Amino acid sequence: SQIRQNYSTDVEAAVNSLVNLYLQASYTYLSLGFYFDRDDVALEGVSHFFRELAEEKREGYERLLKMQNQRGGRALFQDIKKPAEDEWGKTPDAMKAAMALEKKLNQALLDLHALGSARTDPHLCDFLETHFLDEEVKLIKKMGDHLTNLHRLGGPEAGLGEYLFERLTLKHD
Amino acid sequence: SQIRQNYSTDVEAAVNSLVNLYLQASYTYLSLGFYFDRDDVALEGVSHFFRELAEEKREGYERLLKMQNQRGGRALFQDIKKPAEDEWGKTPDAMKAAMALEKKLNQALLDLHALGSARTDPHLCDFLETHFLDEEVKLIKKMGDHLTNLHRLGGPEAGLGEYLFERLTLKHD
Amino acid sequence: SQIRQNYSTDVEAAVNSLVNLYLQASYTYLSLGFYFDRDDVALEGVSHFFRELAEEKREGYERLLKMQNQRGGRALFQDIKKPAEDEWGKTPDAMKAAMALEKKLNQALLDLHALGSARTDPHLCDFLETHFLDEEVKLIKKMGDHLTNLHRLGGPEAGLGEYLFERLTLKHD
Amino acid sequence: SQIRQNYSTDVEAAVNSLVNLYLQASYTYLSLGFYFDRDDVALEGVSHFFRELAEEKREGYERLLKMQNQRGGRALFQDIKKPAEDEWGKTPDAMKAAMALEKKLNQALLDLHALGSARTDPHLCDFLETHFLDEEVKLIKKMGDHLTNLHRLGGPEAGLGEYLFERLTLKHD
Amino acid sequence: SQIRQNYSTDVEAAVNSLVNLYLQASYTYLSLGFYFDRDDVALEGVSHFFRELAEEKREGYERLLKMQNQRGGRALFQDIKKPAEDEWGKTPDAMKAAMALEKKLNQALLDLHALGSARTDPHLCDFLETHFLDEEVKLIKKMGDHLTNLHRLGGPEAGLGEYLFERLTLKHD
Ligand SMILES: [O-][O-]
Ligand SMILES: [O-][O-]
Ligand SMILES: [O-][O-]
Ligand SMILES: [O-][O-]
Ligand SMILES: [O-][O-]
Ligand SMILES: [O-][O-]
Ligand SMILES: [O-][O-]
Ligand SMILES: [O-][O-]
Ligand SMILES: [O-][O-]
Ligand SMILES: [O-][O-]
Ligand SMILES: [O-][O-]
Ligand SMILES: [O-][O-]
Ligand SMILES: [O-][O-]
Ligand SMILES: [O-][O-]
Ligand SMILES: [O-][O-]
Ligand SMILES: [Fe+3]
Ligand SMILES: [Fe+3]
Ligand SMILES: [Fe+3]
Ligand SMILES: [Fe+3]
Ligand SMILES: [Fe+3]
Ligand SMILES: [Fe+3]
Ligand SMILES: [Fe+3]
Ligand SMILES: [Fe+3]
Ligand SMILES: [Fe+3]
Ligand SMILES: [Fe+3]
Ligand SMILES: [Fe+3]
Ligand SMILES: [Fe+3]
Ligand SMILES: [Fe+3]
Ligand SMILES: [Fe+3]
Ligand SMILES: [Fe+3]
Ligand SMILES: [Fe+3]
Ligand SMILES: [Fe+3]
Ligand SMILES: [Fe+3]
Ligand SMILES: [Fe+3]
Ligand SMILES: [Fe+3]
């Protein structure tokens, strides 16, 4: 590139990798979102919560692609693997899957930041600090809170608690 | 003081004492407030309720300090003792601690009013009547009401009741 | 914590420590603020300046506590030591104490950032960069400016200069 | 009186006495106010400050007279003694006279409250608490502050300090 | 130039020269402006006054360059010499340097006008009359006024006068 300056080929490759991980995360949330809209699951606030995450992950990979072009790297795309489950169980099972996905993304971001640090790329380090690291921390905190309220609502009266959590914590209608 | 008139040195000292008690109460509510924001407690309306009390106790000690200066006494500060617990249990345990704290503050206010009465200081007596005694009575009544609704929600289905009380009585989002 | 990821127990402890330092700084500014409101000191712009700093330090420790909870650490509180003086002298003595306090806080922030760097915690490093380091630098610059104008106003005509500085530099009525 | 209930003849008399003291205080502030408007004194902010006090003392005696009629006592007026000085010196001499006057009024209010207490007249006690005691405390605190700023401005450069205090503390034009 | 008409090569060269003098004057005011913002000088109204002059000199050289192009001359730039001092002393020393700089610019403008007159270039003569000569006269008059008020404020109480002049004559906050 006539513009490329201080941008390691290893960072360029790891940015492409992280774009595939966001594409795959977005597709997982797509599937979670539709699953909760099934007539035999029918938790619209849960569905909305995951659809909005599919959108947020989408903005993540678009931001990464834009930055790849601003630095003079070249986007390379790979096949996007289907989500790990076809059916996602009850609200607490889905939320625990989402939390494990966000931990995996957060560790990928932290590995990419360590890589950019090792290549002394402060533009890369600040881009991740600014647009990604704090957003992940807030989201994981929010999922932890939701798992804790789902657990206080669980036990023998679990169907009732699931109905209440969807109605009084999550956003709907 | 060139301004000091009818202001006993014993009232001045007891005002300093009561400022330390408010500082300590404010710090207790700080700790309650953050405890309820932990990802493994996650009751935002409970957290909000205690954070607002930390603020209200803050206004109490600032009002006492301003009055100390208006009467020509001298503020003297002491170390502020840490709150009595590091972890505050469930909503009803926290609310019972808060109620015991407000009883202790209310008795301190009532002892300071008896002292000002014994020193025939009607400015002091009216300052406490106006800014403190009725606010404590209202708050204790409100905590009594909350304890009564927590008790009707307790028993075997306690986690559910705690989730409902936070959602439908306390203020959040 | 079900949410804790890449958050060292040493950072968690040093965040608790820094919260105690902010609590103590806030309490120092409380005392400075009331001291300047005494009828025999009576510099309302000086009092306002320190009261606003008590508030700003308050926002600092609340921000640190919120971040401790977002990362999945646990707030632990200790006794808050009383301020180092009961009487704070004239404006330039108070401002030199405030400056020494802000230097000590700034060095604590810089030590916590070096610690987070040594534990490769970029969320921590960016949190301090964003919310604390530049605010301290600006405040210390402002205190340096105030000390320089107090010094040009000092000497034999010191009472006059102190009255003018409070009236024409500091905010009041 | 067909309306008089629980209103001691000694309180009625002491209310008449206190009305004469307010009339005399108002007349002292009248004289202070015009003195500072003399072409050879010419401190308009000082003049304004005392004229406003003449008005405030006026509202005091009118409030006392209205209350005398509400309780069914009978206003009795006596000759109003002229102010203690024809010329009031410099700002700090005038402010020290005003402060001594407000101390004397404050002690009269405190003696009337002790009297109403000894006659178990809680309407009287609350009337003084509500309309007089806190207003006196605030005013004396304000005069103490002004005396302290006048003192920091005094010494060999006293004419200059007096000009600055009038311009930058007191209200004018 | 296909447009050049009645534009002497000596005027073109002297316009390039005068552009270098304005660049150098602008850079002097830059340095004055930052010097007065140092924590150990701290006179914000003085700093503002010189920063605005850096801007005004900037508009001067841009106006000269635009006019050079309108007449069909060719801008030629030379190295811009650093300002004559690294530290500018107190307000009156800085203002006397600024005044000497404006005298030198004013004499350069007057020499360029005499040159354009000798080449019978009335477009040049009117351009300088309209955009430069009266602006210099007003500015020098204003600097003379400031030097006179600084001198009435000088002597043994010089630090005080400097603080007052910055606060009550110059623009700040
Ligand atoms: O949600 O945009
Ligand atoms: O839209 O973020
Ligand atoms: O939604 O950002
Ligand atoms: O709540 O103010
Ligand atoms: O704010 O009370
Ligand atoms: O909130 O008062
Ligand atoms: O100051 O908020
Ligand atoms: O409020 O910062
Ligand atoms: O005040 O931020
Ligand atoms: O002043 O009414
Ligand atoms: O009018 O008080
Ligand atoms: O003026 O009340
Ligand atoms: O100043 O434009
Ligand atoms: O802008 O002149
Ligand atoms: O500023 O022209
Ligand atoms: Fe959306
Ligand atoms: Fe969104
Ligand atoms: Fe978004
Ligand atoms: Fe969006
Ligand atoms: Fe609030
Ligand atoms: Fe409040
Ligand atoms: Fe309040
Ligand atoms: Fe409030
Ligand atoms: Fe504020
Ligand atoms: Fe603030
Ligand atoms: Fe703030
Ligand atoms: Fe604020
Ligand atoms: Fe009036
Ligand atoms: Fe009035
Ligand atoms: Fe009034
Ligand atoms: Fe009035
Ligand atoms: Fe400008
Ligand atoms: Fe300009
Ligand atoms: Fe301009
Ligand atoms: Fe301009």
From Swiss-Prot, chains A, B, C, D, E:
InterPro entries: Ferritin, Ferritin-like, Ferritin-like_diiron, Ferritin-like_SF, Ferritin_CS, Ferritin_DPS_dom. It is found in: Cytoplasmic vesicle, Autophagosome; Cytoplasm; Autolysosome. Residues 52-59 are annotated as: Catalytic site for iron oxidation. Its main location: cytoplasm. Keywords: Acetylation, Cataract, Cytoplasm, Cytoplasmic vesicle, Disease variant, Iron, Iron storage, Lysosome, Metal-binding, Neurodegeneration. Fe cation binds at residues 52, 55-56, 59, 62. It holds the Pfam family Ferritin. GO terms for molecular function: ferric iron binding; ferrous iron binding; identical protein binding; iron ion binding. GO terms for biological process: intracellular iron ion homeostasis; iron ion transport. It comes from the Eukaryota. The keyword Membrane does not apply. Residues 5-154 form the Ferritin-like diiron domain. GO terms for cellular component: autolysosome; autophagosome; azurophil granule lumen; cytoplasm; cytosol; extracellular exosome; extracellular region; ferritin complex. Belongs to the ferritin family. Oligomer of 24 subunits. There are two types of subunits: L (light) chain and H (heavy) chain. The major chain can be light or heavy, depending on the species and tissue type. The functional molecule forms a roughly spherical shell with a diameter of 12 nm and contains a central cavity into which the insoluble mineral iron core is deposited. Iron enters the spherical protein shell through pores that are formed between subunits. Mutations leading to truncation or the addition of extra residues at the C-terminus interfere with normal pore formation and with iron accumulation. Stores iron in a soluble, non-toxic, readily available form. Important for iron homeostasis. Iron is taken up in the ferrous form and deposited as ferric hydroxides after oxidation. Also plays a role in delivery of iron to cells. Mediates iron uptake in capsule cells of the developing kidney. Delivery to lysosomes by the cargo receptor NCOA4 for autophagic degradation and release or iron. It is linked to Hyperferritinemia with or without cataract: An autosomal dominant disease characterized by elevated level of ferritin in serum and tissues, and early-onset bilateral cataract. Cataracts may be subclinical in some patients. Neurodegeneration with brain iron accumulation 3: A neurodegenerative disorder associated with iron accumulation in the brain, primarily in the basal ganglia. It is characterized by a variety of neurological signs including parkinsonism, ataxia, corticospinal signs, mild non-progressive cognitive deficit and episodic psychosis. It is linked with decreased serum ferritin levels. This is Ferritin light chain. The gene is FTL.
